[PDB]
Amino acid sequence: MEPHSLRYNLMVLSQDESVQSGFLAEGHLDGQPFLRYDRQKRRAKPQGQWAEDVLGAETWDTETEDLTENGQDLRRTLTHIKDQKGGLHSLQEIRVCEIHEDSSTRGSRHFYYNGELFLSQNLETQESTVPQSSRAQTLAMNVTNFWKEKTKTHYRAMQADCLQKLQRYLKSG
Amino acid sequence: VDLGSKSSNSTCRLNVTELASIHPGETWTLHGMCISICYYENVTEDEIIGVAFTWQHNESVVDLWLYQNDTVIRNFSDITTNILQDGLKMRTVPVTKLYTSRMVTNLTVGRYDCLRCENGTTKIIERLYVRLGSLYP
Ligand SMILES: *[C@@H]1O[C@H](CO)[C@@H](O)[C@H](O)[C@H]1NC(C)=O
Ligand SMILES: *[C@@H]1O[C@H](CO)[C@@H](O)[C@H](O)[C@H]1NC(C)=O
Ligand SMILES: *[C@@H]1O[C@H](CO)[C@@H](O)[C@H](O)[C@H]1NC(C)=O
Ligand SMILES: *[C@@H]1O[C@H](CO)[C@@H](O)[C@H](O)[C@H]1NC(C)=O
Ligand SMILES: *[C@@H]1O[C@H](CO)[C@@H](O)[C@H](O)[C@H]1NC(C)=O
Ligand SMILES: *[C@@H]1O[C@H](CO)[C@@H](O)[C@H](O)[C@H]1NC(C)=O
């Protein structure tokens, strides 16, 4: 049996040295969309009949707060990536947690700059992985240095948040 | 042991025997998972907050961890099952969260009470019961 999973996909944008206000976000539960984010209203909302009618409405209050915290963090991170080239630039974070059939858990996050993977972190072990490329290494050094200036607690708390939500959403269905 | 804030004149002496009868702000049960995430607004620098753990199998057996000025000042007496036992402050809102995540075993099942002192009395802002069970539905 395939693992249950909760996946968040957030993206922030910058142009001409300015990180745009707000962020884009979506969430999938066991591979299906369940969450969308209204960038104008600044509200997480249900996506699909199941999320609309089965999940408690408190879901969207919690997700709104959590996405706001995550999205503003991502805006800050983009601000500190060195890139003086013109054009629209993007930073995307994919965050996932899983519960497997043996009841064990997994969790990770992955960062993409202009569509290119440059950093993955295992939220359970704290191990980081950077692709073997000069560009990705530069980006990852950029980001990880900014973060350096409760590291373990920070990463484990992200995993705890995710797992708690996954368990709650699975129960509702 | 004392909880609360000296600067706010809101200190309370913890009596674990009284916790069972306190009405919690929110209360729920997890089967096969022990993740408690308690939400504290406007925590002051000197405020002591924390989490009490009462073992399912003996209501008299109670452990405690405590947090003050963004640091753990007391660990659970047994930390071997701990995955996370620490606080963090949010950036977008003035909230401190206390995280307690542990492996679920015959020794960690029970009641986790997130504590705060208000007007010199012990409050329970959230209570989580933890039971054995399959995480995978
Ligand atoms: C703790 O609480 C119980 C129940 O109210 C009470 O009987 C006992 O005296 C208290 N212990 C102390 C040290 O105050
Ligand atoms: C925390 O303090 C701020 C500033 O004094 C206040 O606006 C807010 O209402 C307080 N939060 C709560 C929930 O008490
Ligand atoms: C809280 O911690 C900081 C160090 O991070 C220290 O400077 C400050 O004095 C502490 N506050 C109290 C009341 O202990
Ligand atoms: C429960 O714990 C108390 C306090 O340690 C102890 O006195 C008592 O014997 C225990 N009872 C059982 C049945 O384990
Ligand atoms: C709590 O446990 C951790 C890990 O063993 C240790 O580093 C820390 O000093 C402990 N804190 C206290 C106040 O006992
Ligand atoms: C308690 O759980 C442990 C695994 O954490 C197991 O090895 C042990 O046999 C259990 N003991 C009892 C009496 O349930």
Author numbering:
A (entry chain A): 0 to 148, 152 to 175
B (entry chain B): 27 to 163
Quote the original article.
We present here a structure-function analysis of one of the best-known HCMV immunevasins, UL16, and its interaction with a cellular ligand for NK cells, MICB. The normal function of MICB is to activate NK cells by engaging the most well-known NK receptor, NKG2D. HCMV-encoded glycoproteins UL16 and UL142 selectively prevent the surface expression of MICB, ULBP1 and ULBP2 (UL16) and MICA (UL142), respectively, through intracellular retention. UL16 is a heavily glycosylated 50 kDa type I transmembrane glycoprotein whose structure could not be predicted from its primary sequence.
In order to obtain soluble and homogeneously glycosylated protein for our structural and surface plasmon resonance (SPR) studies, we expressed the UL16 ectodomain in Chinese hamster ovary (CHO) Lec 3.2.8.1 cells. NK receptors binding to MHC class I or class I-like molecules belong to two structurally distinct families, the Ig superfamily and the C-type lectin superfamily. We find that UL16, which possesses no structural homology to NKG2D, nevertheless employs a NKG2D-like binding mode to interact with MICB. A set of five predominantly hydrophobic core residues on the UL16 surface precisely mimics a set of five equivalent residues in the central region of the interface used by the structurally unrelated immunoreceptor NKG2D to interact with its ligands. Our structure shows that substitution of Gln169 with arginine, which is present at this position in MICA, would lead to steric clashes with UL16 residues Met59 and Leu161 that would prevent binding. In the UL16-MICBpf complex, Ala162 faces towards Tyr125, a UL16 footprint residue. Taken together, these analyses suggest that some NKG2D ligands apparently bypass intracellular retention by UL16 through alteration of a small number of key residues at strategic locations of their potential UL16 binding interface. To the best of our knowledge, the structure presented here is the first structure of a viral immunoevasin in complex with a stimulatory NK receptor ligand as well as the first reported case of structural mimicry through convergent evolution of a human immunoreceptor by a viral immunoevasin.
